[PDB]
Scaffold this motif. Structure first.
Motif, short mmCIF file in Angstrom:
data_model
loop_
_atom_site.label_atom_id
_atom_site.label_comp_id
_atom_site.label_asym_id
_atom_site.label_seq_id
_atom_site.Cartn_x
_atom_site.Cartn_y
_atom_site.Cartn_z
N UNK A 1 0.78 -1.25 0.00
CA UNK A 1 0.00 0.00 0.00
C UNK A 1 0.83 1.33 0.00
N UNK A 2 2.05 1.24 0.46
CA UNK A 2 3.03 2.32 0.44
C UNK A 2 4.05 2.32 -0.75
N UNK A 3 3.93 1.35 -1.62
CA UNK A 3 4.94 1.19 -2.72
C UNK A 3 5.00 2.45 -3.62
N UNK A 4 3.83 2.98 -3.97
CA UNK A 4 3.72 4.15 -4.88
C UNK A 4 4.45 5.34 -4.28
N UNK A 5 4.18 5.65 -3.01
CA UNK A 5 4.84 6.70 -2.31
C UNK A 5 6.31 6.51 -2.18
N UNK A 6 6.73 5.30 -1.81
CA UNK A 6 8.12 5.03 -1.64
C UNK A 6 8.94 5.03 -2.99
N UNK A 7 8.33 4.51 -4.06
CA UNK A 7 8.99 4.63 -5.42
C UNK A 7 9.16 6.13 -5.80
N UNK A 8 8.13 6.94 -5.47
CA UNK A 8 8.19 8.40 -5.71
C UNK A 8 9.35 9.07 -4.99
N UNK A 9 9.62 8.65 -3.76
CA UNK A 9 10.67 9.19 -2.98
C UNK A 9 12.03 8.80 -3.49
N UNK A 10 12.20 7.54 -3.84
CA UNK A 10 13.40 7.11 -4.54
C UNK A 10 13.68 7.92 -5.82
N UNK A 11 12.66 8.10 -6.63
CA UNK A 11 12.77 8.79 -7.89
C UNK A 11 13.17 10.26 -7.62
N UNK B 1 14.09 3.84 -25.44
CA UNK B 1 14.63 5.01 -24.73
C UNK B 1 13.84 5.16 -23.42
N UNK B 2 14.56 5.57 -22.38
CA UNK B 2 13.89 5.82 -21.07
C UNK B 2 14.68 6.88 -20.32
N UNK B 3 14.00 7.69 -19.51
CA UNK B 3 14.64 8.77 -18.78
C UNK B 3 13.81 9.04 -17.51
N UNK B 4 14.37 9.86 -16.60
CA UNK B 4 13.66 10.11 -15.30
C UNK B 4 12.34 10.83 -15.47
N UNK B 5 12.25 11.81 -16.38
CA UNK B 5 10.99 12.53 -16.59
C UNK B 5 9.83 11.65 -17.11
N UNK B 6 10.15 10.69 -17.99
CA UNK B 6 9.24 9.71 -18.51
C UNK B 6 8.81 8.73 -17.42
N UNK B 7 9.74 8.32 -16.55
CA UNK B 7 9.37 7.47 -15.43
C UNK B 7 8.46 8.24 -14.50
N UNK C 1 8.06 -3.77 -9.29
CA UNK C 1 9.05 -4.34 -10.17
C UNK C 1 9.08 -3.72 -11.59
N UNK C 2 7.91 -3.35 -12.11
CA UNK C 2 7.88 -2.72 -13.44
C UNK C 2 8.56 -1.36 -13.32
N UNK C 3 8.47 -0.73 -12.15
CA UNK C 3 9.13 0.56 -11.90
C UNK C 3 10.65 0.37 -11.95
N UNK C 4 11.14 -0.67 -11.26
CA UNK C 4 12.61 -0.90 -11.17
C UNK C 4 13.16 -1.25 -12.58
N UNK C 5 12.38 -1.96 -13.38
CA UNK C 5 12.80 -2.33 -14.72
C UNK C 5 13.07 -1.07 -15.60
N UNK C 6 12.18 -0.09 -15.56
CA UNK C 6 12.41 1.19 -16.24
C UNK C 6 13.61 1.99 -15.72
N UNK C 7 13.85 2.01 -14.39
CA UNK C 7 14.98 2.71 -13.84
C UNK C 7 16.25 2.02 -14.41
N UNK C 8 16.27 0.69 -14.37
CA UNK C 8 17.46 -0.06 -14.80
C UNK C 8 17.66 0.09 -16.32
#
Length: 115
Positions: free
Chosen positions: A12-22, A53-59, A72-79
Motif C-alpha cells: 500500500x506504500x509502494x507508490x509513495x516510496x517509489x516516488x521518494x526514490x525517484x 529510450x527511457x529517462x527520469x521525466x518519462x518514469x 518491479x515494473x518501476x525498477x525495470x524502467x529505472x534499470x
C-alpha cells in the motif's frame, strides 16, 4: 495455486516510496544525462540503436499516471535508463561514469527500502 496463497505482503506504500526514490535520483548531482529524453533528432545513432529510450521525466510521468502495475515494473524502467547509457557511452566518459554511479545509488536505495 487456486485457494492457496502466500501471506499478503503490504504493497500500500509502494507508490509513495517509489516516488521518494525517484525524487532522490532526480536531485543527485550526476542525474543530468538522465533528466530528459535523449533528443533523437540531434543525437546521431540513438534512435536506431536504442530500441527502448527511457529517462527520469518519462518514469515520473508514468508513475504519476498509474502506468506501473507494481514496484518491479518501476525498477525495470529505472534499470533500462542505465542499460541504455552503458549501451551508448564509453565507461571512461563523464556520462558513462554518471550512469555507473546512479545505478549504484539506485540499487542501494532499492535494497534498503524493499529487501
Amino acid at each position: 495455486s487456486m485457494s492457496v496463497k502466500k501471506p499478503k505482503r503490504d504493497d500500500s506504500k509502494d507508490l509513495a516510496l517509489c516516488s521518494m526514490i525517484l525524487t532522490e535520483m532526480e536531485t543527485h548531482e550526476d542525474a543530468w544525462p538522465f533528466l530528459l529524453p535523449v533528443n533523437l533528432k540531434l543525437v546521431p545513432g540513438y534512435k536506431k540503436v536504442i530500441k527502448k529510450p527511457m529517462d527520469f521525466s518519462t518514469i515520473r510521468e508514468k508513475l504519476s499516471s498509474g502506468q506501473y502495475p507494481n514496484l518491479e515494473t518501476f525498477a525495470l524502467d529505472v534499470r533500462l535508463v542505465f542499460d541504455n547509457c552503458e549501451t551508448f557511452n564509453e565507461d571512461d566518459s563523464d556520462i558513462g561514469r554518471a550512469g555507473h554511479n546512479m545505478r549504484k545509488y539506485f540499487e542501494k536505495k532499492w535494497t534498503d527500502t524493499f529487501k
